[PDB]
Amino acid sequence: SGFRKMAFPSGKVEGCMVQVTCGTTTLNGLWLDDVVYCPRHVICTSEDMLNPNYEDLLIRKSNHNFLVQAGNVQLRVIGHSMQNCVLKLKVDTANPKTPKYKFVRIQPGQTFSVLACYNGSPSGVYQCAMRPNFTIKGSFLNGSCGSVGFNIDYDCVSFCYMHHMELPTGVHAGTDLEGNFYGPFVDRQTAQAAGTDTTITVNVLAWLYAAVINGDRWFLNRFTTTLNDFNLVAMKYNYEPLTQDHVDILGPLSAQTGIAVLDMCASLKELLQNGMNGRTILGSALLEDEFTPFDVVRQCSGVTFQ
Amino acid sequence: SGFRKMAFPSGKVEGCMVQVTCGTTTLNGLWLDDVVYCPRHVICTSEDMLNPNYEDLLIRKSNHNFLVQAGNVQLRVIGHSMQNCVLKLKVDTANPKTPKYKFVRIQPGQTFSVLACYNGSPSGVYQCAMRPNFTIKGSFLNGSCGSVGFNIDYDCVSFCYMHHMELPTGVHAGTDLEGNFYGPFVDRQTAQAAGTDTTITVNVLAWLYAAVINGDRWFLNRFTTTLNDFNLVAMKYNYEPLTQDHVDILGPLSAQTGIAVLDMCASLKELLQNGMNGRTILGSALLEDEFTPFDVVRQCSGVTFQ
Numbered sequence: 001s002g003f004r005k006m007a008f009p010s011g012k013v014e015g016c017m018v019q020v021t022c023g024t025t026t027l028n029g030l031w032l033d034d035v036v037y038c039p040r041h042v043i044c045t046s047e048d049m050l051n052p053n054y055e056d057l058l059i060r061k062s063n064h065n066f067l068v069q070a071g072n073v074q075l076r077v078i079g080h081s082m083q084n085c086v087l088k089l090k091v092d093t094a095n096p097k098t099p100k101y102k103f104v105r106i107q108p109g110q111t112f113s114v115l116a117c118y119n120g121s122p123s124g125v126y127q128c129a130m131r132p133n134f135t136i137k138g139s140f141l142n143g144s145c146g147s148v149g150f151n152i153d154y155d156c157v158s159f160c161y162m163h164h165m166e167l168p169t170g171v172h173a174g175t176d177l178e179g180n181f182y183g184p185f186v187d188r189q190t191a192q193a194a195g196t197d198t199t200i201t202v203n204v205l206a207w208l209y210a211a212v213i214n215g216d217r218w219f220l221n222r223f224t225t226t227l228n229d230f231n232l233v234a235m236k237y238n239y240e241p242l243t244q245d246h247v248d249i250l251g252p253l254s255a256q257t258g259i260a261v262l263d264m265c266a267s268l269k270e271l272l273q274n275g276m277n278g279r280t281i282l283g284s285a286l287l288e289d290e291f292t293p294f295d296v297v298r299q300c301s302g303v304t305f306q
Numbered sequence: 307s308g309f310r311k312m313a314f315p316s317g318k319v320e321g322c323m324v325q326v327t328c329g330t331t332t333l334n335g336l337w338l339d340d341v342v343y344c345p346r347h348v349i350c351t352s353e354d355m356l357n358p359n360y361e362d363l364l365i366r367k368s369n370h371n372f373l374v375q376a377g378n379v380q381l382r383v384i385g386h387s388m389q390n391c392v393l394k395l396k397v398d399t400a401n402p403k404t405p406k407y408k409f410v411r412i413q414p415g416q417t418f419s420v421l422a423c424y425n426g427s428p429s430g431v432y433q434c435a436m437r438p439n440f441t442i443k444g445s446f447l448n449g450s451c452g453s454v455g456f457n458i459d460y461d462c463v464s465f466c467y468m469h470h471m472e473l474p475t476g477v478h479a480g481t482d483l484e485g486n487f488y489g490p491f492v493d494r495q496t497a498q499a500a501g502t503d504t505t506i507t508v509n510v511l512a513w514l515y516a517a518v519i520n521g522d523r524w525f526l527n528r529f530t531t532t533l534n535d536f537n538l539v540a541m542k543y544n545y546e547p548l549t550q551d552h553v554d555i556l557g558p559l560s561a562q563t564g565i566a567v568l569d570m571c572a573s574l575k576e577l578l579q580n581g582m583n584g585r586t587i588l589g590s591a592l593l594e595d596e597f598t599p600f601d602v603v604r605q606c607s608g609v610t611f612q
């Protein structure tokens with residue numbers, strides 16, 4: 001029993017992190033086969049970031065402007081190119097610890113683990129969700145750019161996020177591993193802000209199921225509601241609307257607990273309207289929306305990774 | 307910026323996990339050099355655990371009663387012995403991925419990362435604290451015994467916990483890596499319960515500093531209090547008493563924020579007496595006590611590991 005904010009084991013990713021220096025700027029890079037992926041703003045100086053012109057900036061660089069260190073070993077850069085907001089550095093050595101991997105662009109609501117890194121060295125791992133406004137609520141200090149987010153499916157590491165910047169509200173924005181930003185952000189020093197965030201409803205329900213699986217039942221009631229009736233209440237409190245795909249996704253959890261999704265929705269409606277009254281659920285005094293239905297199944301039924 | 311429940315990167319530990327089978331029982335073991343460490347109850351059958359007699363049970367076993375798998379490779383067991391509640395299985399091959407390591411018995415209030423495992427395979431990593439009643443609030447399913455807790459100091463992995471059992475309140479109990487239980491528990495199927503828990507005061511203060519470092523200042527006030535005055539209020543709400551060592555430990559955080567420990571204590575006194583009134587701190591509606599002062603420094607100043 002028990003329920004924790006649980007991250008994926010990070011070993012397979014730790015062996016792919018390297019340090020990348022261009023000029024005075026050092027950040028992290030991801031070394032898979034003979035390519036090192038990193039944020040393209042490593043080729044910038046302070047005079048550039050007002051409105052950098054990355055095509056020009058990259059044409060003025062040569063392979064020897066790039067210092068790549070894997071631990072103590074220097075890697076020789078034999079080619080470079082730009083894809084959207086990422087730089088790809090061809091190196092002369094293929095990473096012998098390259099795991100089976102793929103690049104995935106995730107959807108808001110999905111979760112992933114972040115391996116926070118500084119100077120090529122792993123500092124810590126934690127779990128977070130892509131918010132509906134395409135930010136994540138991370139923990140990042142100077143030098144953290146190029147840190148990656150990932151999932152593990154059976155044996156395949158799915159990379160989905162590379163860190164680029166922090167917004168004035170203290171949240172974080174980055175790209176997929178092909179360099180496309182999540183959300184409307186750009187890699188320039190210009191004023192940007194996240195849109196308003198909403199609560200991920202399907203995830204709150206998944207977490208209520210986890211609570212039931214673990215013996216926190218005080219919020220259940222005998223009522224039912226309809227999708228239409230529930231969604232009307234949801235938008236009033238800034239919750240994402242619930243869809244039929246969401247209902248179907250929650251199926252396994254409904255099955256294991258014997259509570260129908262629409263039953264659970266009437267409990268959630270209740271909690272929105274009267275609050276929790278100093279009671280807690282799974283140790284929290286707030287409704288938690290950073291566990292997906294698959295996260296709950298994984299942690300309450302025990303799937304491992306190879 | 308940002309603040310997350312952050313675990314240590316798990317790569318160095320993942321390479322030491324193995325599967326251990328004795329008879330019908332399979333659990334996890336820790337393979338360092340040529341020794342595999344695992345809970346001694348792997349030598350039990352259901353008929354035994356009422357009141358097992360482990361000396362007798364172990365004398366009736368031979369080296370070939372133990373099946374150790376590292377991935378697909380079987381390891382040959384060439385010796386066995388018992389130390390307190392752990393079994394040590396000498397194997398014929400030394401683990402080539404053995405990190406620099408040590409065994410540490412931690413104190414209540416300290417935190418560590420748990421690498422939850424099933425059948426020798428890492429399932430996920432999360433952070434938790436030794437509670438004052440010598441339990442941890444973990445997440446463990448059948449087959450999880452032998453999963454280990456650890457810290458990383460510079461390059462050395464410090465193992466401090468091996469998982470054995472779950473108590474009726476849904477919390478968890480285990481041993482250090484020399485087999486001594488934390489707390490008054492024993493490895494038998496007999497009625498056991500944890501003592502009453504208390505809140506780890508020095509950790510709540512460390513987390514209030516983290517909040518200030520991250521811009522949550524609404525709970526500060528201009529008052530000060532005394533250790534004696536604060537501790538009197540603390541015991542009323544089931545908080546650990548604060549000591550002068552605690553004050554000294556909080557020194558770096560006091561220094562970086564300019565708020566004196568005794569200032570911060572008057573804010574905490576305030577929060578105990580009037581609550582939070584629907585406000586949050588660092589995204590939480592409860593006072594959080596599972597971050598040590600060192601955890602806050604590590605995450606708000608950026609230390610890495612090699």
Ligand SMILES: *C(=N)[C@H](C[C@@H]1CCNC1=O)NC(=O)[C@@H](NC(=O)[C@@H](NC(=O)NC(C)(C)C)C(C)(C)C)[C@]12C[C@H]3C[C@H](C[C@H](C3)C1)C2
Pocket residue numbers: 027041044049140141142143144145146163164165166167168172186187188189190191192193307
């Ligand atoms: C990566 N190393 C770092 C990430 C930052 C550092 C602290 N926390 C983080 O997440 N990247 C940067 O230095 C970027 N700058 C910031 O994150 C920056 N915020 C900021 O200027 N925001 C707006 C106005 C929205 C652009 C602070 C340091 C937090 C104040 C970038 C990354 C690239 C694009 C852009 C210009 C530079 C190159 C610096 C932001």
Ligand SMILES: *C(=N)[C@H](C[C@@H]1CCNC1=O)NC(=O)[C@@H](NC(=O)[C@@H](NC(=O)NC(C)(C)C)C(C)(C)C)[C@]12C[C@H]3C[C@H](C[C@H](C3)C1)C2
Pocket residue numbers: 001333347350355446447448449450451452469470471472473474478492493494495496497498499
């Ligand atoms: C290890 N594989 C497993 C850990 C458990 C399984 C589910 N969650 C966990 O943490 N160990 C056990 O099966 C132990 N049993 C329990 O944890 C058990 N609780 C229990 O009986 N508690 C008291 C009454 C306090 C002993 C449940 C499965 C949760 C109901 C042990 C481990 C060894 C000592 C003792 C007898 C057996 C050998 C089983 C408990």
